[PDB]
Ligand SMILES: CCCCCn1ccc2c(C(=O)Nc3nnnn3C)ccnc21
């Protein structure tokens with residue numbers, strides 16, 4: 001059941017912004033590791049004396065990497081005279097975020113019809129304001145409310161290229177990397193208490209709970225009207241045999257924050273081949289592969305969706321498979337993206353639910369907790 | 382003239398340590414961009430609850446990348462009970478360094494006969510102490526004194542593998558990259574006033590001035606007894622037509638600090654081919670190439686050292702050439718390594734001065750200031 005209760009018109013995920021200590025080095029690492037092209041910049045070379053921001057794109061996926069310069073470069077400025085291209089940016093907030101959480105997501109940005117009204121309606125419905133609506137060059141409006149921890153939900157709306165003040169990088173520095181990633185499927189938060197987080201966020205968005213179907217967590221998924229904006233949230237479950245991975249996150253992250261980004265690939269096998277080629281030469285590492293018994297058991301579960309060859313291709317690459325009542329989900333998780341065991345990335349591809357493909361086709365892999373523990377001791381054999 | 386006045390026995394450059402906000406991402410970027418292998422780690426997986434430190438090596442060159450974890454992970458510890466593998470590390474110092482300077486070099490480490498005596502003699506001769514000698518697992522002694530800005534000169538000495546507490550990374554994660562870089566040739570500091578910096582450092586080391594031979598700088602080189610440890614220092618010259626690059630550094634770095642690291646390659650042409658292949662896919666960019674007239678003029682200057690083919694190979698790669706009375710220097714500079722126009726890297730190869738090759742053979746490229754401005758307007762033509 002989908003009551004379509006969005007309190008304002010939401011379009012799609014627009015971008016994800018990482019707050020960094022050095023944006024250059026994170027952005028170059030991510031570009032190579034994920035096959036994302038450098039497509040826009042806002043920094044000293046564009047007149048920005050406040051922050052360095054670099055945009056990577058792959059298909060519709062937009063990753064933004066931002067770090068502060070010395071406050072001394074902009075000490076003469078005031079907000080009316082700012083050279084920052086993202087007016088919500090604040091040196092103190094950014095340094096405090098990074099020193100508290102390390103590398104991580106500051107903003108989950110979604111495109112809306114009207115960022116001003118989305119902000120007003122949100123705050124009228126319980127949202128904690130973070131940065132009021134600001135119109136940039138009479139062309140783009142940006143506003144932010146608190147989502148969880150120090151993560152903001154950023155609204156962006158266009159009258160009618162990323163943001164004003166951002167320049168198109170030179171072609172020479174813009175190598176057309178592409179490993180098949182195409183869009184952000186969902187963005188997941190970890191919190192100490194799921195109930196209040198859900199009540200808060202569903203309260204000010206009107207997002208509805210997306211229907212699904214002891215591993216140390218409970219979770220739920222909030223979704224927009226067409227269920228293309230998907231915001232799952234986890235809480236830990238205490239007292240389990242193995243310590244909850246959610247609690248470990250909260251400890252190392254110093255509280256709530258974004259846990260993982262799920263990136264849809266138009267060809268997950270090519271994406272994983274390309275990413276795994278680069279794991280040891282600057283890219284990303286992947287979780288340990290499931291035992292061969294997990295893949296033996298794939299025949300009974302998805303033998304009507306994937307061929308034996310395509311199943312063997314899953315086994316080569318360590319891909320996991322789960323199935324809804326409506327679709328099939330292929331997924332795999334990276335190891336943490338940085339020093340701390342906090343944020344990581346999921347690569348996914350969904351099969352089924354054609355009408356375009358509807359959102360969340362195949363679910364989020366809930367069945368892979370059980371099946372993996374069913375593969376752990378079956379493989380002990 | 383070399384008075385050989387070292388006040389303690391110095392061996393070679395041992396390592397360079399970068400203080401980072403996220404060590405993982407900088408280290409992976411540097412590994413790919415420079416062709417350096419992951420060779421040791423000290424982090425959560427090795428019992429270090431304080432800092433994450435990753436060591437890259439290429440030949441004898443050792444780059445260490447270190448970032449702090451949340452202080453909460455080690456809040457119960459005291460220095461006697463610390464899990465840090467580098468006991469001079471301090472969360473507050475590291476966060477303050479990175480927030481003040483951005484990504485940069487915290488420690489220039491040299492190997493000495495006896496780090497305890499080097500520290501004592503240094504402090505007895507004016508050195509400002511930074512971290513007293515500490516013996517690690519009865520095997521390695523480490524001590525630090527202030528060099529300039531927030532950069533320390535680190536002494537390390539071995540009774541008899543990087544440091545105790547560091548583990549040899551797994552082979553799977555240790556891809557044997559190598560683009561031909563083999564050792565650190567020299568490490569250069571920028572300061573507001575050259576005279577006092579020289580007096581201070583030469584004062585406590587006994588290092589002597591290395592004999593050389595309006596561009597906005599004056600400089601001088603301090604050298605150890607066999608002139609294998611080379612520490613040049615720049616100061617700005619004010620009032621010039623083009624604003625001094627040293628002054629721009631001081632402004633963006635918030636004061637003195639390490640300006641560049643010169644890395645000797647055993648085959649600079651292969652190093653530059655390999656680094657330039659990767660500039661736009663995660664590696665390092667290089668300064669704009671000199672005009673073809675600069676390379677036309679190379680025949681008269683070094684036509685007896687380099688063939689026409691080897692000169693054309695310099696032209697393809699943007700390499701600069703200078704000559705001493707004793708040797709020839711091939712060199713090239715990267716663009717800044719991170720967000721700020723502060724630290725960069727020089728790749729060099731020296732030809733001549735065989736006895737082994739003596740230190741500083743060919744100088745440091747002083748003649749390339751004049752020759753480049755002689756190439757700028759000659760090429761205007
Ligand atoms: C040991 C490897 C497989 C672990 C089992 N496993 C299955 C899914 C899954 C997610 C995830 O993706 N969760 C999510 N995504 N959207 N909503 N939710 C709740 C995060 C961490 N481990 C997961």
Ligand SMILES: CCCCCn1ccc2c(C(=O)Nc3nnnn3C)ccnc21
Pocket residue numbers: 567569600601602613614615668701714727745746747749750753
């Ligand atoms: C526009 C491209 C060529 C610039 C001319 N150019 C020649 C050398 C050089 C150094 C350097 O390497 N300096 C040094 N190294 N050791 N000691 N010193 C003083 C640093 C910056 N620009 C330099």
Ligand SMILES: [Co+2]
Pocket residue numbers: 186188260262346364
């Ligand atoms: Co997920």
Ligand SMILES: [Co+2]
Pocket residue numbers: 567569641643727745
């Ligand atoms: Co140099």
